[PDB]
Paper text:
The Notch signalling pathway is conserved across all metazoan species and plays key roles in many aspects of cell biology including cell‐fate determination, stem cell maintenance, immune system activation and angiogenesis in humans (Guruharsha et al, 2012; Bray, 2016). Aberrant Notch signalling results in a number of inherited and acquired disorders, including various cancers, and it is therefore a key target for therapeutic intervention (Hansson et al, 2004; Groth & Fortini, 2012). Both the Notch receptors and the ligands are single‐pass type I transmembrane proteins, and direct protein–protein contact between adjacent cells initiates an intracellular signalling pathway. All of the Notch ligands have a modular extracellular architecture consisting of an N‐terminal C2 domain (formerly known as the MNNL domain), a Delta/Serrate/Lag‐2 (DSL) domain, and either 16 (Jagged1/Jagged2), 8 (Delta‐like1/Delta‐like4) or 7 (Delta‐like3) EGF repeats. Binding of a Notch ligand to EGF11‐12 of a Notch receptor results in a series of proteolytic cleavages, with the final intra‐membrane cleavage by gamma secretase, causing the release of the intracellular domain of Notch (NICD) from the plasma membrane.
Residue numbers in the entry: 27 to 325
Amino acid sequence: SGVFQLQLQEFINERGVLASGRPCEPGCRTFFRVCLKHFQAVVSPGPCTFGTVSTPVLGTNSFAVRDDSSGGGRNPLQLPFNFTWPGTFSLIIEAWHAPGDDLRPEALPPDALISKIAIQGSLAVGQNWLLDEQTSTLTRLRYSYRVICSDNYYGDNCSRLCKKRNDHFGHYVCQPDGNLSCLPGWTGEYCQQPICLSGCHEQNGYCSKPAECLCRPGWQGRLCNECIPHNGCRHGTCSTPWQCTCDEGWGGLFCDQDLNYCTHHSPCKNGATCSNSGQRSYTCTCRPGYTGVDCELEL
Ligand SMILES: *[C@@H]1O[C@@H](C)[C@@H](O)[C@@H](O)[C@@H]1O
């Protein structure tokens, strides 16, 4: 399958005459009918096996085709086809005069024909336009053509569908041959599998988006490689999840029992000496001249 494209570039008709030799009135308002068919050795009537396409009026007498027009460089004529491109082809381009605004073949008399141009060709699929020119009796047509794949199709038979996407169902662009290429951060057959933050822990962390690391229960840190201590744990750490290994100077299952109230709180004042107590928290031994709970009162 594919699409035959045809550009019409320039048409010369300096006498402004029909194929009959009679002058167009008031000038040749020129449109084109295009018939594309399978190659045959001798030009003979028969159906247009690749189809027909027609243009509006593109100019009068002699003219260069504007880029906007159907047939111009930015809007070429297109004949799509579903079967195998046979390489060789016969192409018929008819220049017609429009005596009015009705371009249908039923409205036109047969002597409105300006010229009939037959082209025998052989072409491979590809992006390059082949330029050519045909001079009839008193007219001349410059045109160019090529065969390409319809949009998002690739391969010499245009059988490979690729269209880029960046959503929940895939993250990729299309290479020239129609094969996926993943956007950065993604892998998997259809570029749906995220690549986690480098270092993400293979058991304790995972990702759903590229370059993140989500932790499984009991783990923390950017790489999900650090255990979480027990929910009640105070002055304690862990090696594996939910432990509570007390810091130096603390005890209990939740590492909240102060094993050195004196150092951790420094209650005593005026240079007194602190000692721990299980009944009263601590005791301050005053220097000479001081009294009180914390030796804060001067004797
Ligand atoms: C503890 O006792 C008090 C009375 C002060 O003499 C301190 O210097 C000492 O460490």
